[PDB]
């Protein structure tokens, strides 16, 4: 005695994969390409809706990866090509004001490079940081000469992260997980619907995550499979750890024409003493932070067991040391003073030595190299450590080491709260109404 009744505008949805667009709010993220945001966004709480989230199968991460790389490459399209620099360099050591920490790190190179006119050359003198120069046999070449084309980054374009809001297209919605102590893979008892995400800054780093969100109550340890030693562990911190990084040298930056309409920037000289770049982390804060991490790890690995921290086992510098963009310079900072402790159930800082490199190969690609022009003056930056990337060695003692290098993990950490669903407004149910 029941009849089919059709309803349109039914509040249901399905998991779906669609293309999201950016909304933002000169720079390397080409934010002028985004649709400006709504000053008064809404969040609609969904009472009595429990949804399954899975941060590891989330394709929002894959899109963020594809767009960050694409934006990055587009920003270099109009920039000066440095092909003329792949010449033999004649290099000697910088020895005039050295503290012996930087023994051999800087090199004073000279070379024959072109001028505005094709029939004329000029002799150029410049400084290199050793990591970016390789010996040929005092004859050197740049490291990119046998693998890639080199492009100078445009000096007018900032690399500072700008928050990006991702927005679902009409017909789709983004569900956000509001639960505290949520590890990213289980059911989420409290959710809400938003059209656009929290702005996410595309901060790029390895080993330790910088300037992200904080855990609401306690350190949260997230992994695809915690017992699989091959997986990375993303640890979100409850409170930030402050880190102060610097390149404590007053650099004089010079530039020359290399061809019509094009100029090259290089470090001319250094004023005063030459000192090693470094980062400062407070010891007490760092030791408390690890204690919190260890407690949470014991919940998975045992109270009657031992947790030991150790340095990355080895591999490429881009993976094994900490890396970040500070003022536009690229830093490679050792983490050995951060992960050297065995945990068994003071106004002082940890000083981390750092290296500087001018030739950069991002996103783990080969054939596309970028030259970061040097910055005049002295650079200092302060940032918050908001999470860690750890791996585990394959007894009673477990060893954890810094890991990462796969950029999708940094994003994944920020996007863990969101999933995209398709709205399916049309459906049927039996009623007593017939016609």
């Amino acid at each position: 005695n029941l009849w089919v009744t059709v309803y349109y505008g039914v509040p249901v949805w399905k998991d779906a994969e669609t293309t999201l667009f950016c909304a933002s709010d000169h720079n390397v993220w080409a934010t002028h390409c985004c649709v400006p945001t709504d000053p008064n966004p809404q969040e609609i709480h969904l009472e009595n809706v429990t949804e399954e989230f899975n941060m590891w199968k989330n394709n929002m991460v894959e899109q963020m990866h594809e767009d960050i790389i694409s934006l990055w490459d587009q920003s270099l399209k109009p920039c000066v090509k440095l092909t003329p620099l792949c010449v033999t360099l004649q290099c000697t050591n910088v020895t005039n004001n050295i503290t012996d920490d930087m023994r051999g790190e800087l090199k004073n190179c000279s070379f024959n490079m072109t001028t505005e006119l094709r029939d004329k050359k000029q002799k150029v003198y410049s400084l290199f940081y050793r990591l970016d120069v390789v010996q040929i046999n005092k004859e050197y070449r740049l490291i990119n000469c046998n693998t890639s084309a080199i492009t100078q980054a445009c000096p007018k374009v900032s690399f500072e992260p700008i928050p990006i809001h991702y927005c679902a297209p009409a017909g789709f919605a983004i569900l956000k997980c509001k639960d505290k102590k949520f590890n990213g893979t289980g059911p989420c008892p409290s959710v809400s619907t938003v059209q656009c995400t929290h702005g996410i800054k595309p901060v790029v780093s390895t080993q330790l995550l910088l300037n992200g969100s904080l855990a609401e109550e306690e350190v949260i340890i997230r992994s695809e499979n915690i017992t699989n030693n091959a997986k990375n562990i993303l640890v979100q911190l409850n409170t930030p750890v402050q880190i102060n990084c610097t390149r404590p040298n007053n650099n004089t930056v010079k530039s020359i024409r290399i061809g019509p309409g094009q100029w090259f920037y290089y470090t001319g000289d250094i004023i005063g003493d030459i000192r090693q770049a470094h980062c400062n982390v407070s010891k007490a804060t760092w030791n408390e932070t690890l204690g919190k991490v260890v407690k949470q790890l014991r919940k998975h690995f045992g109270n009657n067991t031992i947790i030991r921290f150790a340095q990355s086992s080895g591999g490429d510098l881009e993976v094994t040391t900490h890396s970040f963009n500070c003022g536009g310079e690229f830093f490679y900072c050792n983490t050995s003073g951060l992960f050297n402790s065995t945990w068994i159930s003071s106004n002082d800082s940890i000083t981390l030595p750092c290296r500087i490199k001018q030739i950069i190969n991002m996103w783990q690609r080969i054939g596309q190299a970028m030259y970061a022009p040097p910055i005049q003056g002295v650079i200092r930056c302060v940032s918050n450590i908001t999470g860690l990337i750890l791996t585990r060695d394959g007894s009673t003692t477990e060893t954890f080491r810094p890991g990462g290098g796969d950029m999708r993990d940094n994003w994944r950490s920020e996007l863990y709260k969101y999933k995209v669903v398709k709205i399916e407004p049309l459906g049927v149910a039996p009623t007593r109404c017939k016609r």
């Binding site: 949805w13 009472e47 809706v49 709205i423 459906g427």
Partner: protein, 124 residues
């Protein structure tokens, strides 16, 4: 009221009064292509559902009663269970296996009705 999908999780009966809220929020440098593709999909979806409503004879309504009887084989439940103790997400999952059957029946019924109407007008 609740701006969008606010009724999700409420009972099917309670949620029937917000159909307007969800319906009115549908359809509302190569990064230009991604934007066009998204805008086009917003139109292709939606327009596709409007066609089904058209075919079934529900083109102008949010709530449309038809002449197709309900089969207990799709779902053998009390109406009070369906409307008072379930939400729409749950309901859609329970009968997701019979959706194509029901839709096919709705099309057959409307087609027969249009032919019958034409004959009656011819006789009148």
């Amino acid at each position: 009221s609740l701006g969008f999908l606010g009724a999700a999780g409420s009972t099917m009966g309670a949620a029937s009064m917000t159909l307007t809220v969800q319906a009115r929020n549908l359809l509302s440098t190569h990064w230009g292509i991604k934007q066009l593709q998204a805008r086009v999909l917003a139109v292709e979806h939606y327009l596709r559902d409007q066609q089904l409503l058209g075919i079934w004879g529900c083109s102008g309504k949010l709530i449309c009663c038809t002449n197709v009887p309900w089969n207990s084989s799709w779902s053998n439940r009390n109406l009070s269970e369906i409307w008072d103790n379930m939400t729409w997400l749950q309901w859609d999952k329970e009968i997701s296996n019979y959706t194509q059957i029901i839709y096919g029946l709705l099309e057959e019924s409307q087609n027969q009705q249009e032919k019958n109407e034409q004959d009656l007008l011819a006789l009148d």
